[PDB]
């Protein structure tokens, strides 16, 4: 481990042999120790290796390759680390090792050898203006296979080869941490390549991402009756269906109905199952005056329109076809759909289905943004690129009897369906568990991108196929937490420490310490709570400060 060993990986006559012959290294530079800053932990002396694998040309004429960045510390804990992606990937991160949970420390700051990838395409090169911008990679079938599983496999094999070459020995254990799309990766790793990583953290995982566009079309068509006004193309303004004050009224009614169902009134719905059975906005009341939430006469700032409650109920039910078959899943009611801290309302929930209120056009993720564009180009087979101005209308005429079949369809050179290369719904985790693999999953209740109930349903099927699943896999649902972060909940936590303590040392996480990044939702300076493994919830012990984990334990729901 030295500077010369770092630069000898930059091709030359050196004996660094890559598993894939098509691996090309651009950068191999020795980096000095960066002292800690106010927002990041100290990074040690490390070797940075940057390169690309499988440089080719797609069937669309665009150049494709699988980029990687690798940082290897001089003082190394013998452990390997890969961080997951986000969105449709296409960008190469700093490769310091984000562990999620709003953490100051990075994996590299903890002396891990860190690797990262771009997914098999670049957002600067593969930006076709006739194929909905940065999702244009979906026009080439191999770029889909790289975004699905191939790129992460290839980068993992190259990273371990370089680690073994630079350190003279193989990594002891390998760990992966990803949120959203990176959470889908982590589950895909445990299923397609169980031998690669010993510990895996998958947060808010989109293990059914090709289905999010179907829910997005259902969302749009359910809320359109409540929409007020048209945009430049005559599409209803979904963002105008609910004001930010309206959403706060809804989250307040959920709080008035389900907050005490866990045994404590604290602005947190810890008994999510009891809320689904108890809450119905058509019958619930506004806790601020005891009157009913659904308006009896004309709309006021103290009531929701009957057309509004109907719309949100249909959206939360989940998409179905005329045959009644559920196309995705239903969503959970939770207080994290809104939230007012200081001046700002919570946008972490409405930004997916509705969009920003003060906008004369649609800007919801599922109406015209990246999510709807991604389904049209990357998840549907054959892909249907189009002008951006027509994506909103495409989600308005979405036929739930013809269009949902495109995520299982195959056509021409697109030899694999999107649910085949992107899906991660398998419960075949025996090979992963039996070699010592441990997996931690977390998901917020107020996640509008992916349903936490759907993650729980997968966790139930895993426990059915493999008795004793809690010995290698636990699910930690987070109340109030939005997608990956934000909302009135404890969204900050260190998940790399328990993951290491589980894989090695064999200590199962009976709970996970967590605190709130914005405690002002509850009007306090700080709030710390334990995250409990499914299906346990946090139970108040009966005395002490309600903003300290020491007064809370993990118990079965009351």
Is residue 268 marked as binding? yes
Q: Which among 50, 106, 180, 418 is annotated as catalytic?
A: 180
Across the strands, what pairs with 540? 552
Report the candidate in 464, 413, 420, 458 with the shortest Cα–Cα distance to residue 439. Answer: 458
* Closest approach of Ca ion to the CB of residue 158, in Å: 47
**Alpha-helix runs per DSSP H in 304-389:** 306-317, 350-353, 370-374
Is residue 130 marked as binding? no
Across the strands, what pairs with 29? 48
User: Which residues make Cβ contacts (< 8 Å) with residue 371, sequence separation at least 6?
Assistant: 212, 213, 216, 352, 365, 449
Across the strands, what pairs with 128? 133
**Interface region with Ca ion, contact rule CB under 5 A, candidates 251-259, 283-291, 294-302, 328-336:** 251-259
**Interface region with Ca ion, contact rule CB under 5 A, candidates 207-215, 254-262, 281-289, 401-409:** 254-262
259 near Ca ion (CB under 5 A): yes
**Interface region with Ca ion, contact rule CB under 5 A, candidates 268-276, 316-324, 348-356, 455-463:** 268-276
Site for Ca ion in 172-191 (CB under 5 A): none
CB-wise, 65 or 266, nearer to Ca ion?
266
Report the candidate in 232, 256, 227, 231 with the shortest Cα–Cα distance to residue 243. Answer: 227
CB-wise, 268 or 419, nearer to Ca ion?
268
* Closest approach of Ca ion to the CB of residue 259, in Å: 5
CB-wise, 354 or 445, nearer to Ca ion?
445
Alpha-carbon distance of 445 to 265, in angstroms, equals 18
Is residue 428 marked as binding? no
Helix (H) or strand (E) holding 392: helix 391-396
* Closest approach of Ca ion to the CB of residue 264, in Å: 5
Is residue 87 marked as binding? yes
Cis ω for the linkage preceding 382 (within 30 of 0) = yes
CB-wise, 185 or 334, nearer to Ca ion?
334
Structural contact between residues 303 and 284, judged by C-beta atoms closer than 8 angstroms: no
* Closest approach of Ca ion to the CB of residue 267, in Å: 7
268 near Ca ion (CB under 5 A): yes
Q: In terms of residues, how long is the chain? A: 558
Alpha-carbon distance of 123 to 361, in angstroms, equals 25
Structural contact between residues 264 and 550, judged by C-beta atoms closer than 8 angstroms: no
Q: Which among 46, 483, 485, 491 is annotated as catalytic?
A: 483
Structural contact between residues 465 and 427, judged by C-beta atoms closer than 8 angstroms: yes
Alpha-carbon distance values, 414 to 125, 147, 479 (Å)? 22, 14, 40
**Interface region with Ca ion, contact rule CB under 5 A, candidates 259-267, 380-388, 443-451, 464-472:** 259-267
Active site residue 180: yes
CB-wise, 151 or 528, nearer to Ca ion?
528
Is residue 266 marked as binding? yes
CB-wise, 496 or 546, nearer to Ca ion?
546
Q: What is the per-residue binding string for Ca ion in 43-72, x denoting contact by CB under 5 A?
A: ------------------------------
**Interface region with Ca ion, contact rule CB under 5 A, candidates 15-23, 122-130, 253-261, 506-514:** 253-261
Alpha-carbon distance of 527 to 549, in angstroms, equals 8
* Closest approach of Ca ion to the CB of residue 254, in Å: 11
* Closest approach of Ca ion to the CB of residue 342, in Å: 23
Q: Using the rule CB under 5 A, which residue among 146, 231, 244, 266 binds Ca ion?
A: 266
* Closest approach of Ca ion to the CB of residue 287, in Å: 14
> Tokens 């303004």, residue?
237
Burial 186-203 (b: 16+ CB within 10 A, else e): bbbbbbbbbebbbbbbbb
- Number of residues in contact with Ca ion under rule CB under 5 A: 6
Q: Which among 334, 447, 454, 491 is annotated as catalytic?
A: 447
Measured torsion, CA atoms of residues 288, 294, 298, 300, in degrees rounded to the nearest 10? 30
Structural contact between residues 359 and 239, judged by C-beta atoms closer than 8 angstroms: yes
CB-wise, 16 or 264, nearer to Ca ion?
264
Neighbours of 307 (CB within 10 A): 13
Is residue 262 marked as binding? yes
Is residue 505 marked as binding? no
Q: How many CA atoms lie within 13 A of 371 on its CB side?
A: 29
CB-wise, 226 or 335, nearer to Ca ion?
335
Structural contact between residues 103 and 492, judged by C-beta atoms closer than 8 angstroms: yes
**Interface region with Ca ion, contact rule CB under 5 A, candidates 208-216, 270-278, 334-342, 417-425:** 270-278
Active site residue 447: yes
Is residue 366 marked as binding? yes
Structural contact between residues 518 and 498, judged by C-beta atoms closer than 8 angstroms: no
Alpha-carbon distance of 538 to 540, in angstroms, equals 7
The closest residue (CB) to Ca ion is 262
Catalytic positions, please? 180, 447, 483
Q: Which residues are annotated as part of the binding site for Ca(2+)?
A: 259, 262, 264, 266, 268
Binding residues for 4-[(2-hydroxyethoxy)carbonyl]benzoate: 87, 181, 366, 371, 483
- Residue ranges for the known binding site are 87, 181, 259, 262, 264, 266, 268, 366, 371, 483
Question: Where does this chain bind Ca ion (CB under 5 A)?
Answer: 259, 262, 264, 266, 268, 270
């Amino acid at each position: 481990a030295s500077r010369a060993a770092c630069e000898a990986l930059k091709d030359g006559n050196g004996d660094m042999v890559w598993p894939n012959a098509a691996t090309v290294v651009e950068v191999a530079a020795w980096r000095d120790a960066a002292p800690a800053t106010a927002s990041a932990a100290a990074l040690p002396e490390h070797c940075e290796v940057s390169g690309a694998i499988a440089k080719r040309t797609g069937i669309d004429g665009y150049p494709y390759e699988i980029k990687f960045r690798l940082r290897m510390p001089a003082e190394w804990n013998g452990r390997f680390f890969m961080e997951g992606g986000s969105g449709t990937n296409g960008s190469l991160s700093a490769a310091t090792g984000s562990i999620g949970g709003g953490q100051i420390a990075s994996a590299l700051s903890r002396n891990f050898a860190v690797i990262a990838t771009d997914g098999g395409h670049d957002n600067a090169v593969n930006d076709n203006p006739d194929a909905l911008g940065t999702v244009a990679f979906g026009l080439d079938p191999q770029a889909r296979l790289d975004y699905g599983y191939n790129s992460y496999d290839q980068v993992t094999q190259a990273g371990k080869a370089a680690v073994a070459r630079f350190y003279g020995r193989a990594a002891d254990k390998s760990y992966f941490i990803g949120c959203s799309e990176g959470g889908r990766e982590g589950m895909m790793l445990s299923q397609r390549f169980p031998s690669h990583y010993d510990g895996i953290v998958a947060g808010a995982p989109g293990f059914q991402l090709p289905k999010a566009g179907i829910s997005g079309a259902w969302t749009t068509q359910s809320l359109a009756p409540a929409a007020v006004g048209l945009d430049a193309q005559g599409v209803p303004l979904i963002n105008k269906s609910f004001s930010d004050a309206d959403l706060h009224l809804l989250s307040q009614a959920i709080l008035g109905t389900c907050d005490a169902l866990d045994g404590l009134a604290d602005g947190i719905v810890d008994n999510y199952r009891a809320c689904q059975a108890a809450f119905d906005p058509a019958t619930a009341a506004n806790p601020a005056n005891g009157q009913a939430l659904q308006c009896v006469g004309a709309k006021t700032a103290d009531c929701l329109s009957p057309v509004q409650v109907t719309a949100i109920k249909r959206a939360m039910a989940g998409p179905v076809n005329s045959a009644g078959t559920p196309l995705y899943n239903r969503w959970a009611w939770d207080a994290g759909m809104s939230g007012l801290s200081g001046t700002t309302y919570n946008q972490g929930w409405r930004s997916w289905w509705l969009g920003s209120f003060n906008s004369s056009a649609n800007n919801a993720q599922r109406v015209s943004g990246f999510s709807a564009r991604s389904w049209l180009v990357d998840f549907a087979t054959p892909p249907e690129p189009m002008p951006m101005t027509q994506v909103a209308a495409r989600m308005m005429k979405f036929d739930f009897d013809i269009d949902p079949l495109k995520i299982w369809a195959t056509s021409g050179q697109f030899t694999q369906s999107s649910m085949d290369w992107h899906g991660a719904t398998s419960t075949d985790l025996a090979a992963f568990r039996d070699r010592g693999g441990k997996m931690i999953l977390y998901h917020g209740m107020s996640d509008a991108a992916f349903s936490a109930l759907d993650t729980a349903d997968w966790y139930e099927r895993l426990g059915a196929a493999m008795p004793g699943a809690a010995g290698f896999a636990r699910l930690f649902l987070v109340p109030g937490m939005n997608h990956c972060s934000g909302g009135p909940g404890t969204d900050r936590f260190d998940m790399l420490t328990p993951l290491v303590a589980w894989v090695e040392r064999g200590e199962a996480p009976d709970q996970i310490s967590a605190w709130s990044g914005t405690p002002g939702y509850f009007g306090v300076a700080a709030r710390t709570r334990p995250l409990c493994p499914y299906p346990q919830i946090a139970r108040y012990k009966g005395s002490g400060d309600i903003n300290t984990e020491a007064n809370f334990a993990c118990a079965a729901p009351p």
